[PDB]
């Protein structure tokens, strides 16, 4: 799910 983690760092940064 590595695609997860790039859904997840928009929500971030």
Same mark, same amino acid.
């Given at each position: 799910?590595? +695609? $997860?983690? !790039?859904? @997840?760092l !928009? @929500? $971030? +940064?």
């Open positions: 799910g590595l +695609f $997860d983690i !790039v859904k @997840s !928009v @929500s $971030d +940064f």
